[PDB]
Design a protein around this ligand. Structure first.
Ligand SMILES: [Zn+2]
Lengths: 101, 58, 83, 191, 52, 73, 187, 59, 58
């Protein structure tokens, strides 16, 4: 069990990782507090030649078009050309997408 | 009841910290703190200036 | 101006009262509400917004498609209005 | 691997701060600051840095004092305000490469990646460029001498991004710009 | 495209501008007939915008 | 006299001509303009508010749109 | 300007409400200009400055007193019957930056050119608190007292005292202070 | 830069209503070095964009 | 003292790096004259912030 006693350091590393996810997970709540407006999304895949191409086309409700890659958290029911999405003030990022109807 | 004639001493330390902070002057409100010592009433000297992490409140 | 005389003397406290009551986001009417924090709202300038309710207004005092007073700085709902 | 580096004047102005915050003790050693920058592109780009209380001994070179907690806290708060820059390397402001600097370097070869070293000068009386990027690599020698950490010079340029130009140029009002023609050509052609 | 480095852009919202070229990208995609992407600061070009 | 000439800050350079929509008994009325900006301020001097005859053009600001007076037409 | 020498306080006897209306340096300049009005009076000057508040002997504004000394030095410029002996015990009195500052100005101006090492010494311990305003007065008096004397440790004391502080009024007061000492040292 | 004012009506309280580009119609006293009566209504003028002071009459 | 400084390189050109430190007056000083600051020489340099809305507009 002398070879398996190095697992203790690994577990202290990982519970330390669970100690340190509280702050960077804590800023999720204060950055993602209020999606201020609703903006139309049109999904359009890009190519960069990692350097992989990944993009989407945005249109604000006040009809102003900007540029951004596919951003946010891990997406399954996203990537749709849909509306009612999360957005911060001038960052114009995607945080919380919801179905309108 | 008294007021004097004050004048603010600015180093290049605080200046380029406000210029890195001005490159960090993206559209969002940003935060920082000026430090130094007050030697008298009517002169003020800055030395130490750092930045602060952003918040959605601003 | 004699009606504006006593009101002109009553314009003193309008400066200390100008810091409250100042907020008007062009009286946006709501559309629906997804969940009790988040309200889907549209301004009259055709920008669809989402903000949470403030603490001063009850969510049972929210009505569907309601013109209310609402902040233009923190964007929350300070006070409602009947029509 | 890396052909050149870019060091912004902000960190050397923080070496002016290294010579400011001394407090007149009588020590004035090669005070080490924790160099930060962008190893991300093939070119290295220094944005900013900070410094750490570092002490050696009078007689012994191999006694040297750093901090991991101060590194992780200052780098932690700095990464909290700006995560677009990471740890890269370090520097001592002494003119001389000590024997201990392989071991002092080795701490940031471990915890940081392959760290760059910068020799600069305590008194800027050198007409030459004060900054020299020394890559921390072990190279195999033809004589058969055993392999050790070897500091090969990587060429450097000192550039400012946008606002550092404006603030520096406002602070000077003494330097003149490019100004091709008689003077700025012929002064280089003088000295 | 008047200068081979610096040309006229047409925004979606309507106002027109002139921009520079980024040191990373080259003049291949920078030929006209290419809808592009720009920044608020310095009006630089990070990459283009393929139409669909 | 000085109090008559102290509200000049509101009717000075930061001044606009908006269109009144209605007058509210809560003394903060709702106004409009080319974008239809709706701002409610508790009332000030020089306004009539009865023969004002709502639905007309009134005087607004670049500031918080405190109604400093009215102008007939 | 207009009432200098003619000792006419009768223009400033029109009102007390236009002079003492602000607690500021304006009362110091008012008492100073009062010193410009009358000059060359050995009894009525100190008597007149004593007439202003001999009630509780505690001025709420210190500028009346320090303007009393700063004005008094304007009165007794190059008098041979100096009350400097009293003004050293009066500068010996403990007060902040008006006995220090205005006492340095008035007492050094009355001691102009005498090249006394004593007023030089108390001047040095007036500038040794490193404040900009009273040491500004110390330099301004020091140029007056060291006219032509050219004391050896004094010049290197002043320029050596110059770069060791970040205050600026000490730098301009010592600027005029090392200015006035140098007269006929053309060679 | 500065805007282009057009006065359509001069007001007798020395606070000239001036027809501005949309969301305009900014009634204001123009600068003190220029008199009001010289500014003829229904003519285009030169106006600053924030301080709303007139420069000159324009054809 | 409590110095407040606003850096704004966004509409500031790269030719000039004009920055200003701002102050709060006391609300009870409105009866008296506003700023009893002596030594009024440098105010000729302090009229460099002369934008016709913000400085004297506010
Ligand atoms: Zn803002």
């Amino acid at each position: 069990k002398i070879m398996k006693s190095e697992v203790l350091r690994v577990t202290h590393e990982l519970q330390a990782m669970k100690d340190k996810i509280k702050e960077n997970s804590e800023k999720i709540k204060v950055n993602k507090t209020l999606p201020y407006l609703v903006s139309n999304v049109i999904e359009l895949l890009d190519v960069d030649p990692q350097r992989k191409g990944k993009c989407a086309v945005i249109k604000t409700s006040t009809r102003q078009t900007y540029f951004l890659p596919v951003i946010g958290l891990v997406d399954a029911e996203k990537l749709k050309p849909g509306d009612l999405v999360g957005v911060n003030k001038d960052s114009y990022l995607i945080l919380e997408t919801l179905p309108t109807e | 009841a008294v007021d004097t004639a004050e004048q603010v001493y600015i180093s290049s330390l605080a200046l380029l910290k406000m210029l890195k902070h001005g490159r960090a002057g993206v559209p969002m409100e940003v935060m920082g703190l000026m430090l130094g010592e007050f030697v008298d009433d009517y002169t003020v000297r800055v030395i130490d200036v750092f930045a602060m992490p952003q918040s959605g409140t601003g | 101006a004699p009606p504006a005389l006593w009101d002109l003397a009553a314009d003193k406290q309008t400066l200390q009262s100008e810091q409250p009551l100042q907020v008007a986001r062009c009286t946006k009417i709501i559309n629906a509400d997804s969940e009790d924090p988040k309200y889907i709202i549209n301004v009259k300038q055709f920008a669809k917004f989402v903000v949470d309710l403030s603490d001063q207004v009850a969510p049972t005092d929210i009505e569907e498609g309601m013109r209310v007073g609402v902040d233009r700085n923190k964007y929350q709902i300070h006070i409602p209005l009947p029509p | 691997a890396v052909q050149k580096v870019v060091v912004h004047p902000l960190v050397l102005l923080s070496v002016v701060d290294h010579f400011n915050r001394i407090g007149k003790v009588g020590n004035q050693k090669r005070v080490v600051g924790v160099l930060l920058g962008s190893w991300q592109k093939k070119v290295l780009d220094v944005s900013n840095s900070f410094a750490v209380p570092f002490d050696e001994d009078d007689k012994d070179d191999s006694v040297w004092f750093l901090d991991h907690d101060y590194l992780e806290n200052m780098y932690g708060m700095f990464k909290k305000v700006n995560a677009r820059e990471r740890i890269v390397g370090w520097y001592h402001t002494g003119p001389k490469l000590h024997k201990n600097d392989i071991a002092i370097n080795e701490l940031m070869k471990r915890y940081c990646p392959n760290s760059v070293l910068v020799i600069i000068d305590v008194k800027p009386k050198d007409l030459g460029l004060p900054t020299e990027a020394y890559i921390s690599v072990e190279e195999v020698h033809d004589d058969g001498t055993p392999t050790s950490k070897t500091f090969e010079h990587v060429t450097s340029e000192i550039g400012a991004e946008e606002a550092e130009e404006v603030g520096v140029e406002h602070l000077l009002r003494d330097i003149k710009d490019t100004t091709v023609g008689t003077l700025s050509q012929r002064i280089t052609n003088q000295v | 495209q008047l200068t081979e480095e610096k040309f006229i852009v047409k925004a979606t919202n309507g106002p027109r501008y002139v921009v520079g070229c980024r040191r990373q990208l080259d003049k291949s995609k920078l030929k006209p007939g290419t809808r592009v992407a720009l920044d608020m600061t310095t009006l630089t070009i990070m990459r283009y915008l393929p139409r669909e | 006299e000085e109090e008559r000439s102290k509200v000049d800050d509101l009717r000075g350079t930061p001044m606009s001509v908006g269109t009144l929509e209605e007058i509210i008994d809560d003394n903060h009325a709702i106004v409009s303009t080319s974008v239809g900006s709706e701002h409610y301020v508790s009332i000030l001097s020089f306004v009539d508010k009865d023969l004002l005859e709502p639905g007309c053009s009134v005087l607004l600001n670049h500031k918080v749109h405190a109604v400093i007076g009215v102008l007939m037409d | 300007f207009m009432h200098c020498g003619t000792t006419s306080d009768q223009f400033l006897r029109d009102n007390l409400e236009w002079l003492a209306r602000a607690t500021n340096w304006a009362k110091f300049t008012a008492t100073a200009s009062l010193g410009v009005i009358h000059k060359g009076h050995e009894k009525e000057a100190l008597q007149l400055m004593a007439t202003y508040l001999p009630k509780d002997t505690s001025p709420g504004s210190a500028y009346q007193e320090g303007g009393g000394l700063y004005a008094l030095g304007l009165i007794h410029a190059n008098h041979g019957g100096d009350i400097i002996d009293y003004l050293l015990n009066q500068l010996k009195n403990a007060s902040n930056d008006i006995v220090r500052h205005g006492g340095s100005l008035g007492l050094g101006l009355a001691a102009m050119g005498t090249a006394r090492q004593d007023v030089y010494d108390l001047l040095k311990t007036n500038l040794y608190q490193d404040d900009a305003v009273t040491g500004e007065a110390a330099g301004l008096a020091l140029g007056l007292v060291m006219l032509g004397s050219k004391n050896a440790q004094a010049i290197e004391d002043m320029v050596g005292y110059a770069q060791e502080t970040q205050h600026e009024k000490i730098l301009r007061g010592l600027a005029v202070g090392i200015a006035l000492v140098m007269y006929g040292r053309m060679e | 830069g500065s805007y282009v004012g057009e006065v359509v009506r001069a007001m007798d309280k020395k606070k000239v209503l001036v027809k501005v580009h949309p969301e305009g119609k900014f009634v204001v006293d123009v600068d003190k070095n220029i008199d009001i009566n010289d500014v003829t209504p229904n003519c285009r003028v030169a106006l600053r964009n924030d301080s709303y002071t007139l420069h000159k009459i324009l054809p | 003292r409590a110095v407040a400084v606003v850096v704004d390189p966004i509409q500031s050109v790269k030719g000039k790096v004009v920055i200003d430190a701002f102050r709060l007056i006391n609300a009870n000083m409105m009866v008296l004259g506003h700023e009893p600051r002596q030594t009024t020489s440098n105010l000729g340099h302090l009229n460099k912030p002369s934008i016709q809305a913000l400085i004297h507009g506010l």
